[PDB]
Design a protein around this motif. Structure first.
Motif, PDB file in Angstrom:
ATOM      1  N   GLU A  15     -20.031 -40.900 -16.939  1.00 30.41           N
ATOM      2  CA  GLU A  15     -18.965 -40.809 -17.924  1.00 30.41           C
ATOM      3  C   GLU A  15     -19.499 -40.200 -19.211  1.00 30.41           C
ATOM      4  O   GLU A  15     -20.464 -40.723 -19.775  1.00 30.41           O
ATOM      5  CB  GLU A  15     -18.366 -42.202 -18.172  1.00 30.41           C
ATOM      6  N   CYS A  16     -18.875 -39.111 -19.672  1.00 29.09           N
ATOM      7  CA  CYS A  16     -19.355 -38.405 -20.873  1.00 29.09           C
ATOM      8  C   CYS A  16     -19.511 -39.371 -22.047  1.00 29.09           C
ATOM      9  O   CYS A  16     -18.607 -40.154 -22.339  1.00 29.09           O
ATOM     10  CB  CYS A  16     -18.419 -37.254 -21.278  1.00 29.09           C
ATOM     11  N   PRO A  17     -20.666 -39.315 -22.720  1.00 30.04           N
ATOM     12  CA  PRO A  17     -21.004 -40.127 -23.895  1.00 30.04           C
ATOM     13  C   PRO A  17     -20.098 -39.853 -25.095  1.00 30.04           C
ATOM     14  O   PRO A  17     -20.169 -40.577 -26.086  1.00 30.04           O
ATOM     15  CB  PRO A  17     -22.445 -39.704 -24.219  1.00 30.04           C
ATOM     16  N   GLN A  18     -19.303 -38.788 -25.017  1.00 28.68           N
ATOM     17  CA  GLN A  18     -18.265 -38.504 -26.003  1.00 28.68           C
ATOM     18  C   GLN A  18     -16.931 -38.521 -25.283  1.00 28.68           C
ATOM     19  O   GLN A  18     -16.673 -39.431 -24.523  1.00 28.68           O
ATOM     20  CB  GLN A  18     -18.493 -37.167 -26.692  1.00 28.68           C
ATOM     21  N   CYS A  19     -16.123 -37.481 -25.472  1.00 28.49           N
ATOM     22  CA  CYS A  19     -14.697 -37.413 -25.049  1.00 28.49           C
ATOM     23  C   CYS A  19     -14.199 -38.303 -23.892  1.00 28.49           C
ATOM     24  O   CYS A  19     -12.989 -38.499 -23.714  1.00 28.49           O
ATOM     25  CB  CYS A  19     -14.346 -35.958 -24.706  1.00 28.49           C
ATOM     26  N   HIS A  20     -15.128 -38.819 -23.105  1.00 26.04           N
ATOM     27  CA  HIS A  20     -14.826 -39.821 -22.087  1.00 26.04           C
ATOM     28  C   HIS A  20     -13.746 -39.432 -21.081  1.00 26.04           C
ATOM     29  O   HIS A  20     -12.572 -39.726 -21.246  1.00 26.04           O
ATOM     30  CB  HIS A  20     -14.482 -41.154 -22.764  1.00 26.04           C
TER      31      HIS A  20
ATOM     32  N   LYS B 167     -15.214 -37.842 -16.949  1.00 29.40           N
ATOM     33  CA  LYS B 167     -16.460 -37.923 -16.194  1.00 29.40           C
ATOM     34  C   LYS B 167     -17.212 -36.580 -16.033  1.00 29.40           C
ATOM     35  O   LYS B 167     -16.632 -35.495 -16.162  1.00 29.40           O
ATOM     36  CB  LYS B 167     -16.171 -38.524 -14.827  1.00 29.40           C
TER      37      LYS B 167
ATOM     38  N   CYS C 127     -19.869 -31.602 -19.571  1.00 29.93           N
ATOM     39  CA  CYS C 127     -18.689 -32.452 -19.435  1.00 29.93           C
ATOM     40  C   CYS C 127     -17.380 -31.670 -19.594  1.00 29.93           C
ATOM     41  O   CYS C 127     -17.023 -31.242 -20.667  1.00 29.93           O
ATOM     42  CB  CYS C 127     -18.765 -33.588 -20.451  1.00 29.93           C
TER      43      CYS C 127
END
Ligand SMILES: [Mg+2]
Ligand SMILES: [Mg+2]
Ligand SMILES: [Mg+2]
Ligand SMILES: [Mg+2]
Ligand SMILES: [Mg+2]
Ligand SMILES: [Mg+2]
Ligand SMILES: [Mg+2]
Ligand SMILES: [Mg+2]
Ligand SMILES: [Mg+2]
Ligand SMILES: [Mg+2]
Ligand SMILES: [Mg+2]
Ligand SMILES: [Mg+2]
Ligand SMILES: [Mg+2]
Ligand SMILES: [Mg+2]
Ligand SMILES: [Mg+2]
Ligand SMILES: [Mg+2]
Ligand SMILES: [Mg+2]
Ligand SMILES: [Mg+2]
Ligand SMILES: [Mg+2]
Ligand SMILES: [Mg+2]
Ligand SMILES: [Mg+2]
Ligand SMILES: [Mg+2]
Ligand SMILES: [Mg+2]
Ligand SMILES: [Mg+2]
Ligand SMILES: [Mg+2]
Ligand SMILES: [Mg+2]
Ligand SMILES: [Mg+2]
Ligand SMILES: [Mg+2]
Ligand SMILES: [Mg+2]
Ligand SMILES: [Mg+2]
Ligand SMILES: [Mg+2]
Ligand SMILES: [Mg+2]
Ligand SMILES: [Mg+2]
Ligand SMILES: [Mg+2]
Ligand SMILES: [Mg+2]
Ligand SMILES: [Mg+2]
Ligand SMILES: [Mg+2]
Ligand SMILES: [Mg+2]
Ligand SMILES: [Mg+2]
Ligand SMILES: [Mg+2]
Ligand SMILES: [Mg+2]
Ligand SMILES: [Mg+2]
Ligand SMILES: [Mg+2]
Lengths: 57, 117, 127, 110
Positions: A30-35, A37, A44
């Motif tokens: 899961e992307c550490p920003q925009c959230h 995957k 991302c």
RNA sequence: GUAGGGGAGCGUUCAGUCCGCGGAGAAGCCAUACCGGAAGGAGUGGUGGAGCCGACUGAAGUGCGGAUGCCGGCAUGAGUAACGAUAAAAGAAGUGAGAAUCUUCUUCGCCGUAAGGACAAGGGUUCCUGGGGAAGGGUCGUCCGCCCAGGGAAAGUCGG
RNA sequence: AAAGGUGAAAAGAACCCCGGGAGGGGAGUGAAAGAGAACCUGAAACCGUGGACUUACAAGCAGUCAUGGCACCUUAUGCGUGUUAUGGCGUGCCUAUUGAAGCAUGAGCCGGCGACUUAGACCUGACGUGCGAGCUUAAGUUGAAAAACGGAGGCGGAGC
RNA sequence: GGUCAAGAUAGUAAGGGUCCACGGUGGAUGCCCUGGCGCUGGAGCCGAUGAAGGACGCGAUUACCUGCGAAAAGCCCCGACGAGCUGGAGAUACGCUUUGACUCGGGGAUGUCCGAAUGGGGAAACCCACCUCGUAAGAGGUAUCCGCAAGGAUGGGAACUCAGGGAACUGAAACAUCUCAGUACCUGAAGGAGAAGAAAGAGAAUUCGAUUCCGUUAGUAGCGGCGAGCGAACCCGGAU
């Protein structure tokens, strides 16, 4: 010449053969920003983040 | 008038097929190979009625010999022993005595080796 | 209930969390390859995995997944954060058939098969 | 194999006549003949009545819109009535004038 | 017990007659541990939605596993061979629900007595415009020689 | 060549949800959408999902017999039903043949179509029926929701 | 109990198998009819007055079908019916109709172009003319054979009829006469039928009395590599 099968292959056989066609589901992070995957070591695809922000929007 | 097949063939077929459940692969799902498997099954059924009568006798005999020899007697000598003393027992029954009731089988042994003396 | 007809009046059958794509111009065994990843899995997951599976089929299947979601939420008032793919499968549509030429005079018949994708969403508590 | 074939394309009643509904769900209700089609044997009576749907078409109006209009019926659930009896009634052909044919019951006439 | 002869029957349509069922649900289909010496036959339940069982009698297009039989559907081979000249592609940009395939730009590569241009024969609207995307395109298509609509072809002197 | 079937009636599903669409889920109509326009029933081959018991030391025409294990209880608590472990036993079917598991023929599979019949007023037997030293009509005529007439002819009657 | 040791046994199934449940595919089965089949009976010709069969057209929208023919889903009069109609087509619009529509029955008018085609040509459905009337528009005529003329002929028609011509396979368990068989096929002419017909006859009773057809005589008399096999007639009874 011109080989051909001698005998119909049973449904059972045919399916034993297929015991290896299982797709392999992505390992997904899961992307550490925009959230949403992403794939490890890829960008991302939701935001565009790879530490700051590379692909566009 | 004409008379189609209508309904008969499928009933026959389902009959065979329904005899044939638990048969491996096409042997239980294709009519012809069912029907066929079944012919050979015929042979095997008839035969084995006679043959199981052959088989069980065998079993009884095995057990009997065993018990016989526990108490130091061969089977054959044990059975002439029984016929001599005019004990008239089924070997089905002799087996069951031999397997189930120790002392009793013992007693029959002593009676028979007496009949042998 | 006393009569079949009586039941057919009184009840009406419902298809709780169920969608079906019919006549998808694909091949079942293919589409299955995708589906088998989706199945048993908790709807969110399914939504993602379908975005990173690099088969074609992945897309029609994504779409049915969403249709079943929107049938369990809307037409059935179920609880998103508890949805999971209770069941999913593919069966064979009417397969398109076309002649194709071959060497010398021979001809052949390609079976462009078709597909019925079916997903069935359903809530999951452990208790 | 048309519906009128069995009934010789003939209507046993005219348009504008009043009619009692013999058979079915609307037993006995009564009404004026708004439309009668001989060959098809179908007839409209201000009593049957259904709710039809106008679907997409932007005429009439972009949105859908539902509607209440009567749905025609098969000739054989229709009869001329008799002012006296008031009920389902057969018909005799008798004469008047001056060359007019007319319709009586067991007590003429409608 | 093979060819073969003989004997008693089972089931199928149609027909006559008798019995009689059927929307509180027929035939057909489906499951089943019951019945009969066998062909076979009932009981119950599920399906179905309008016809039909039993009995006696009559007449047959009357009983299938075979015929490299006939028509049809679906399997196997198998996610295999192949995707039709080894002239070759790259990036940007645009579009779009979706683009390696469509559009534009910049280059690259291949034909150049040809892989360029113009007639004839043949084909028949395939041309142009605007739209479309099921199938046809050996992938994909938002594109097309495909699908829909509307336009387009002008002769005293060219050919008859 | 193949081609047939919503429903009694189009009341042919307004409107809402996912989707570009296709398709579907609702709602509404309908007696029934367990009839939605890929619309009567909807068998089998064939493809799948789920569950029961099972299988990774095993030599097999796949059955059959015996027993043990598990499971199940609507012709079902026993004569059981399903499934299995292990032991004994076992050379597919058809055809053609002196002799077939044969490495001889046919066959992918299932479903349907698929083969001893008709005719004559012929011949000859068996069975049955009516008349019986006699028996019978054919063309046809009339009648005809039926049948009756019709003796021309034919068969027995004696052979050599 | 803990360590070690010796021995025995269990579960997990990548995939498979048997059974059960629930679906998909597919179109058997049952029910049905809008389509056929045979038999019986009826009815039987069309065409130079342009046929059978077509081409091109006619529609508010018209691709297919139907109907029609520049008077073009139709025009005139007569008869029937008496309220609906505006073809299959179910689709919107225009509208028609009790001064009688629509449909049914009966006659007429119109009836492009091709097709016996027939003005000449032609690769059917298209190209090019000449004559008389007419103001032009248009109309009519322009083939061959019999005939003085009038008028007739040509072409088409599943079977049925007669006529000119006339097979082979096959059967003879080979084949040649024979047989298939005067069948198939080809050509001709004609009709609703046609053929045939009014005894130089059949026949043997000095009998019968145009022809055709049915029964029967009769597998008789005969025919025949006297092999395979082929096969009457008279009488008698009917139909007319
Ligand atoms: Mg013995
Ligand atoms: Mg015997
Ligand atoms: Mg009966
Ligand atoms: Mg029946
Ligand atoms: Mg077969
Ligand atoms: Mg072969
Ligand atoms: Mg085939
Ligand atoms: Mg591969
Ligand atoms: Mg290979
Ligand atoms: Mg390879
Ligand atoms: Mg390759
Ligand atoms: Mg290429
Ligand atoms: Mg390359
Ligand atoms: Mg954009
Ligand atoms: Mg390319
Ligand atoms: Mg640019
Ligand atoms: Mg060129
Ligand atoms: Mg041109
Ligand atoms: Mg493609
Ligand atoms: Mg677009
Ligand atoms: Mg173009
Ligand atoms: Mg000029
Ligand atoms: Mg929709
Ligand atoms: Mg309701
Ligand atoms: Mg399973
Ligand atoms: Mg070992
Ligand atoms: Mg093991
Ligand atoms: Mg031999
Ligand atoms: Mg023999
Ligand atoms: Mg072998
Ligand atoms: Mg073999
Ligand atoms: Mg051989
Ligand atoms: Mg073979
Ligand atoms: Mg007798
Ligand atoms: Mg697994
Ligand atoms: Mg036309
Ligand atoms: Mg005119
Ligand atoms: Mg009139
Ligand atoms: Mg009328
Ligand atoms: Mg001419
Ligand atoms: Mg010869
Ligand atoms: Mg010969
Ligand atoms: Mg002629």
């Amino acid at each position: 010449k011109h080989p051909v099968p001698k005998k119909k292959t049973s449904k059972s056989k045919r399916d034993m053969r297929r015991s290896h066609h299982a797709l392999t589901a992505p390992n997904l992070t899961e992307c550490p920003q925009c959230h949403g995957k992403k794939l490890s070591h890829h960008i991302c695809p939701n935001c565009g983040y790879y530490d700051g922000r590379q692909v566009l929007a | 008038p004409r008379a189609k097949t209508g309904i008969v063939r499928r009933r026959r077929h389902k009959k065979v097929l329904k005899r044939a459940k638990g048969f491996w692969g096409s042997r239980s799902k294709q009519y012809r190979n069912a029907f066929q498997t079944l012919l050979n099954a015929a042979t095997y059924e008839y035969r084995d009625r006679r043959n199981k009568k052959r088989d069980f006798r065998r079993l009884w005999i095995q057990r009997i010999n065993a018990g016989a020899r526990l108490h130091g007697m061969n089977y054959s000598t044990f059975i002439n022993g029984l016929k001599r003393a005019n004990i008239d027992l089924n070997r089905k029954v002799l087996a069951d005595i031999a397997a189930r009731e120790p002392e009793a089988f013992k007693a029959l042994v002593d009676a028979s080796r007496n009949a042998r003396q | 209930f006393r009569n079949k007809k009586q039941r057919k009046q009184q009840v009406k059958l419902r298809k709780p969390g169920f969608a079906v794509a019919k006549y998808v111009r694909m091949s079942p065994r293919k589409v299955r390859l995708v589906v088998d990843v989706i199945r048993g899995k908790s709807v969110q997951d399914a939504e993602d995995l379908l975005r990173f599976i690099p088969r074609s089929a992945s897309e029609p299947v994504a779409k049915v997944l969403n249709s079943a979601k929107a049938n369990a939420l809307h037409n059935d008032e179920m609880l998103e954060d508890r949805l999971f793919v209770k069941e999913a499968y593919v069966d064979a549509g009417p397969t398109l058939k076309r002649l194709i030429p071959r060497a010398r005079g021979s001809a052949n018949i390609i079976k462009k098969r078709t597909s019925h994708i079916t997903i069935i969403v359903a809530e999951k508590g452990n208790k | 194999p048309s519906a009128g074939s069995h009934h010789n394309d003939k209507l046993h009643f005219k348009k504008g006549d009043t009619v009692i509904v013999l058979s079915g769900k609307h037993k006995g209700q009564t009404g004026k003949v708004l439309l009668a089609l001989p060959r098809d044997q179908k007839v409209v009576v201000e009593g049957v009545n259904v709710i039809t749907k106008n679907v997409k078409p932007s005429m009439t109006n972009p949105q859908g819109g539902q509607e209440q209009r009567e749905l025609a019926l098969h000739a054989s659930k229709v009869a001329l009535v008799d002012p006296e009896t008031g009920k389902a009634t057969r018909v005799r052909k008798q004469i008047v004038d001056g060359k007019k044919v007319r319709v009586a019951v067991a007590s003429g006439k409608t």
